[PDB]
Ligand SMILES: O=P(O)(O)O[C@H]1[C@@H](OP(=O)(O)O)[C@@H](OP(=O)(O)O)[C@@H](OP(=O)(O)O)[C@@H](OP(=O)(O)O)[C@H]1OP(=O)(O)O
């Protein structure tokens with residue numbers, strides 16, 4: 001376990017290169033980037049859920065703000081999608 | 091990164107939030123569409139099967155709505171539209187893994203059902219809320235073929251009753267039933283079949299019977315279904331006999347998990363008490379079909395402290411509702427229906443005082459649907475004062491254009507108070523003597539309102555104008571016999587793009603003005619529904635019978651009957 005108690009959780013496993021020291025600590029104390037890597041389905045389900053909450057019910061702009069995504073939409077595409085979204089699917 | 095994003099995304103299940111994520115970047119738009127499970131299509135002429143099938147390839151669940159709501163007031167002639175086949179045909183080849191189809195006000199044929207039945211293997215949920223054009227033959231097919239069915243729900247649908255035999259076509263291996271609503275059927279289903287059915291389905295939580303199941307047979311069904319959460323009785327009348335009463339009582343209290351009760355057709359007051367075991371845990375009760383008198387209802391209701399929803403005839407009366415008001419501190423939604431609407435002189439003593447009571451007495455009343463014969467601004471003012479938390483308010487005064495009966499004034503300040511005080515009012519529906527002033531009120535205050543309905547109200551286009559101009563959240567407006575026409579509509583035409591539809595029927599909208607709107611607004615679909623021949627056989631300036639405007643991204647539809655005209 002680098003950089004058999006309750007260490008079989010990870011099905012990437014049951015000697016690590018794509019993890020660090022301060023990270024491994026937090027996993028055993030019990031990122032997502034990881035939680036994945038390793039397969040620990042309940043921790044993947046921990047983070048992915050509360051993350052999905054940073055999102056729940058915020059504007060597209062409001063999300064990419066409070067994340068860090070560059071809007072890569074030509075206003076052409078951005079307006080036509082919003083039209084479909086709102087006229088057909090909401 | 092793709093996989094983690096897919097996992098985050100599966101938690102987000104709200105349409106508004108799905109759309110929101112589809113619009114955060116080209117990549118989110120792509121992950122998002124591929125793992126979208128459900129599509130809500132509120133107006134099926136708004137977009138095309140094909141457009142949908144390609145945006146959302148892996149869809150498990152489809153809900154679609156057809157004719158607008160004023161089809162319930164028999165105001166959308168047969169032929170208008172609604173056709174679902176095209177939807178089935180398209181999804182049939184594209185949506186192998188489709189699990190549910192919930193449809194509202196659509197035309198559905200035996201053909202469609204056949205097709206659902208043979209194309210969809212994981213099929214599990216069919217809800218047909220007020221549909222037409224299939225028969226029990228249609229149902230047979232589903233019973234026969236859908237190995238995996240969990241819900242068959244036919245709320246106020248209008249079926250062709252070819253025979254009760256459809257239900258036996260369900261094979262003996264079938265066990266997965268969770269929910270059966272067959273209240274609209276008249277076809278008497280085979281009782282043996284139904285019984286064997288209820289018995290081999292351990293997961294069946296909702297069973298809603300038709301009138302053809304007699305009170306006498308109910309007890310037997312419940313012994314087989316002790317785990318029921320929702321029951322709709324069949325008939326509720328019989329010769330009065332305590333073997334009968336007792337078998338009821340026993341069977342019923344054997345259902346510890348019952349929360350919801352309805353049905354009760356021709357209910358005999360002597361047989362209601364059987365249901366008291368239940369009463370103390372009920373959250374929903376629907377007594378709409380029961381013409382039981384007030385004291386009875388009262389006797390029933392003091393038993394029901396946990397009651398959250400109540401639908402009832404006006405037989406309840408004010409005395410009725412004063413009790414309700416002290417008894418059910420948990421009431422969320424009340425619907426009082428009329429027992430005899432084609433009589434302007436009371437048969438019950440249901441007045442405004444009724445609704446006023448409930449409103450002081452139920453901290454949590456938020457939905458209302460109430461038919462009386464008389465009303466006052468004093469009452470509406472108080473109502474609005476007590477229930478700032480109100481969210482759907484539909485009043486309906488039997489005799490139209492009726493004024494406040496104490497002062498004689500129109501009800502504008504009445505309804506003005508509702509919309510001023512119920513800052514989250516998202517639905518409103520109106521009656522009595524009303525002048526453009528109410529609309530000015532709505533336009534100033536109803537900022538969150540989504541749905542408005544109006545009949546015999548208003549003075550001039552100045553009214554529709556205030557609504558179109560004021561109501562930021564408006565999604566659906568629908569109007570009949572009001573003095574509203576061309577000025578308001580054209581003045582406000584782009585509002586129409588931020589709205590799902592406008593219904594105006596028996597109003598003053600001229601064919602000319604329809605023509606012009608259609609021109610200004612390609613992306614709308616301005617349908618004129620009229621049955622007295624072509625609208626050029628008449629001077630441009632003549633009112634059409636009905637016009638139905640709605641945004642769409644699919645352009646004009648192809649299935650217009652012959653009394654329908656796109657502009
Ligand atoms: O328009 P209605 O024929 O009245 O029927 C309903 C409904 O009203 P019911 O309460 O009578 O079912 C809901 O509206 P609310 O009472 O909750 O306001 C509803 O579905 P929701 O449960 O999603 O609200 C929906 O409205 P929508 O699709 O606008 O949300 C819809 O009106 P439709 O005739 O548009 O289906």
Ligand SMILES: CCC[C@H](C(=O)O)c1c[nH]c2ccccc12
Nearest residue numbers: 484485486519520521543544545
């Ligand atoms: C009370 C009956 C239900 C209906 C509604 O609330 O949408 C309605 C109530 N009041 C109305 C006046 C005009 C058109 C529809 C209505």
